[PDB]
């Protein structure tokens, strides 16, 4: 596992010793090389895991997330290359350093043999993204967004530290292998109920759960493109990964403690989707769609069945890729219009046809069209919920319907109709943006050919 961590750490001296006009080239090249190296982790076993050492290990659940995290950084660099043109070399190096540190923290977070180390790195990731949002942010509300994003997560995660140290003092270890092998049932007690709440709330606040999702539209609107990319693709999956790992010790309490949350998601995935129908901002619309998808993932995790787990993993990967693509598209529009409103730039398919094709493919992926992995995860979770209770389908069906609607809404308002007359600074699309979209979309349709790589360890 060190063969991935060490080059990521070496990315920092490379960036700081690079020429004043070559930082982007070397950063992108070596990030892509690190992604190629990390591709080896996909080789998994039907047995326990690949236990590299006493400190790190990999699984069929950590492997897709690690590969996605390593693949993200070149895309973030290409996205951030444009709007940082008038920046001093030292500050560009600081920005690249923040991105590299965030990737390193996520890489060592997703392996994490021991729960306290996982918590340490999972809380360490809060700093680079907070600095990115509050420093390289366009609007004056970036400070409030940073405060919200920091304090929601810290309030959720502070009881988790107490719960984890209490676990280590009682059972004796926090190593995940020993935790799984020496697992014992949880008695129905008030102490155990608060134990469950402390262990669960920290991850459920970052998914985000409906009603605890107020921070996400703010942190998405006020962040730069790289911040929105990283927080929509991987940083949302930290909560899902945490719940998937930690639920092994919460049984059989979860059978009846999950009821308040399931409802909050089952209704919430509807409500936010309806919110997407009436939105004047592209970024807010995509943020609310992300909230809906992550609510469905929460339902899948709380159901706690094999099909639920595989569907949740596939949905996490697919949602990350699609959300990053959509935010790239929105940022490309913003860099031309500088407005970030839906109704100003209209009829863009007349002006940018290939970008219209990219919009169509992104919307179709978000619409969960077969045989894309989005639909694979969605269908697996829907079937598992149907087995959980035959009535759930109703809500599920409604959400699916509404989903398609708003997706096509986002496709029709921005690309069809009559172009706005007074916007004439719509330059033809660069090769950089088109390459970014192609590198976003081709992995999705390639993963569609081999779903077993993203179906988790329960495949």
């Amino acid at each position: 596992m060190l063969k991935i961590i060490i080059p990521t750490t070496m990315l920092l001296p490379m960036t700081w010793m690079s020429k004043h006009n070559m930082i982007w080239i070397n950063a992108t090249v070596h990030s892509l090389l690190i992604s190629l190296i990390s591709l080896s982790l996909l080789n998994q076993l039907g047995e326990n895991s690949l236990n590299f050492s006493l400190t790190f290990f990999s699984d069929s659940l950590s492997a897709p997330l690690l590969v996605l995290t390593t693949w993200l950084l070149p895309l973030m660099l290409m996205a951030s290359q444009s709007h940082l043109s008038k920046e001093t070399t030292t500050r560009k190096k600081l920005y690249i350093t923040m991105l590299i540190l965030l990737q390193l923290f996520l890489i060592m977070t997703f392996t994490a043999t021991e729960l306290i180390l996982f918590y340490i790195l999972f809380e360490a990731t809060l700093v680079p993204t907070l600095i990115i949002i509050t420093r390289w942010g366009n609007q004056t509300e970036r400070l409030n967004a940073g405060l919200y994003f920091l304090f929601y997560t810290l309030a959720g995660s502070l009881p988790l530290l107490v719960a984890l140290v209490y676990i280590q003092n009682t059972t004796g270890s926090l190593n995940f292998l020993i935790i799984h092998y020496w697992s014992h049932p949880l008695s129905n007690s008030w102490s155990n109920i608060f134990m469950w709440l402390a262990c669960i709330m920290a991850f459920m606040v970052k998914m985000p759960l409906y009603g605890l999702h107020l921070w996400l539209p703010k942190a998405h609107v006020e962040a730069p493109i790289a911040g929105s990319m990283v927080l929509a693709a991987v940083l949302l999956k930290l909560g899902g990964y945490g719940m998937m790992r930690i639920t092994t010790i919460l049984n059989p309490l979860t059978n009846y403690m999950a009821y308040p949350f399931l409802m909050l998601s089952m209704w919430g995935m509807i409500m936010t989707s309806s919110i997407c129908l009436r939105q004047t901002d592209l970024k807010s619309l995509i943020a609310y769609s992300s909230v809906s998808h992550m609510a469905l993932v929460i339902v899948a995790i709380m159901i706690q069945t094999p099909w639920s787990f595989m569907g949740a993993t596939a949905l996490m990967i697919a949602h990350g890729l699609t959300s990053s693509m959509l935010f790239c598209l929105a940022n490309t529009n913003y860099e031309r219009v500088h407005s970030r409103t839906m109704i100003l730039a209209r009829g863009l398919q007349t002006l940018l046809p290939l970008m219209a094709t990219w919009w169509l493919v992104a919307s179709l992926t978000n619409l969960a069209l077969p045989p894309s992995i989005n639909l694979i995860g969605e269908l697996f979770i829907i079937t598992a919920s149907f087995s959980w209770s035959n009535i759930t389908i109703i809500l599920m069906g409604m959400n699916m319907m509404i989903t398609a609607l708003y997706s096509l809404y986002m496709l029709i308002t921005t690309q069809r109709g009559k172009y706005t007359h007074h916007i004439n600074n719509i330059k033809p699309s660069f090769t950089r943006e088109n390459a970014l979209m192609a590198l976003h979309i081709l992995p999705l349709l390639l993963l569609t050919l081999n779903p077993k790589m993203i179906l988790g360890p329960l495949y």
Binding site: P306, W307, M310, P451, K452, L455, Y459
Partner: protein
């Protein structure tokens, strides 16, 4: 062996060639509509044979060729059913589509 399966899969296979050629040079000329129409007509006249074989005997087949994945006890594979309904509806649909595309080569000239 058993040309039923080969021809039934060949019709669908050759129906997709102009989609792959959509990035080639023929897509940038005015001969593409005739190319697609000719491909459709060839597909129809090729598909006419399995229907004849069924009419003579009553041949029915399932072709499970590509195994997509396996989910515990469930197995999802690329399977085509070529019973009476399929081998009868394919020629009719291809004939109708050929007529429609020949008409559209006139209707949508501008």
């Amino acid at each position: 062996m058993n040309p039923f399966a080969s021809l039934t899969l060949t019709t669908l296979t050759i129906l997709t060639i102009p989609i792959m050629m959509s990035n080639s040079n023929i897509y940038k000329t005015n001969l593409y509509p005739n190319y697609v129409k000719t491909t459709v007509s060839y597909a129809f006249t090729l598909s006419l044979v399995p229907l004849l074989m069924f009419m003579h005997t009553g041949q029915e087949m399932i072709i499970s060729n590509w195994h997509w994945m396996t989910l515990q006890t469930v197995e999802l594979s690329l399977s085509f059913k070529m019973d009476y309904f399929s081998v009868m509806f394919i020629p009719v649909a291809l004939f109708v589509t050929w007529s429609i595309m020949e008409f559209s080569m006139w209707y949508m000239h501008s």
